[PDB]
Symmetry: C3
């Protein structure tokens, strides 16, 4: 079904190494449990200090882009969002009402120099 | 039709708070008038100082990624691009010939910890 | 077929001007030879110093997002990935096993203030 998951987290707050490590840990679990495979591997990029505007405010907000090969079973993104958002709230203090999560997928994506 | 619009603006110039606030204002109008709903809310992320190369030049250029739930009525992106590009030119001095705008959408996207 | 190609390169290492210029040169060739048209033009954005986690490690890794108008002939992404990854390894020392490349496309995308 879904493979090679990549998450980009864009946040207006500053993150440090502990918080990125904690986020990567959380995302990895969420991906393993909700997206499919235990032994899966997950790539996780953090763009912090990125100003974000939302509802007329620049208070801390987040956007996460989830990508993967194939296409999603329609139940899985529903299960993932509240976990992703909870993990962002815990590590970053950003309330869920200022967190956007979008999921995309493709048939074309490549790793170790060879497409899936 | 189209919901929960997110714009990421990637620019090679430096932006300050006034210019991001002006861009967020402009995007909000463009989204409300062209994309659908008045009371809509719009998330707007600014990655400035990001080097961009184009036509063999690294002079100031821009890329904007527009995302939203569902799929676009085919007339709306056509209407949005010239407004987005005009707003970037005004706030950033980037000529329209170095501005790329791409639109994506998904059926899976989530807010306040719950998918749309 | 495929038009207006945009590449975003996200790397956890620092890039300098020579290395971005070399990457933009390489991407341009790869796009011209594999994606379609000689006289094509290619936009290339570099987000360096972006922490990335993968397989439990934050050693240097890369993610590249390739975007373009239309949709891909299914052979072309297969041909592009190993070139993109080779170019990243050469300029950045990142081994191919920590390089992800994803390809997306849209029917809606705009330049010089007018959609394709």
């Amino acid at each position: 079904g879904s493979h090679m998951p990549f998450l980009q987290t864009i946040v207006s707050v500053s993150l440090d190494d502990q918080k990125r490590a904690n986020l990567s840990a959380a995302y990895g679990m969420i991906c393993r449990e909700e997206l499919g495979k235990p032994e899966d591997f997950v790539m996780t990029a953090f763009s912090d200090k990125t100003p974000i505007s939302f509802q007329g405010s620049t208070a801390p907000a987040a956007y996460v882009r989830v990508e993967s090969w194939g296409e999603y079973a329609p139940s899985k993104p529903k299960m993932m969002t509240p976990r992703i958002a909870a993990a962002i709230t815990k590590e970053c203090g950003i309330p869920a009402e200022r967190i956007y999560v979008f999921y995309y997928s493709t048939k074309h994506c490549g790793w170790n120099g060879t497409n899936f």
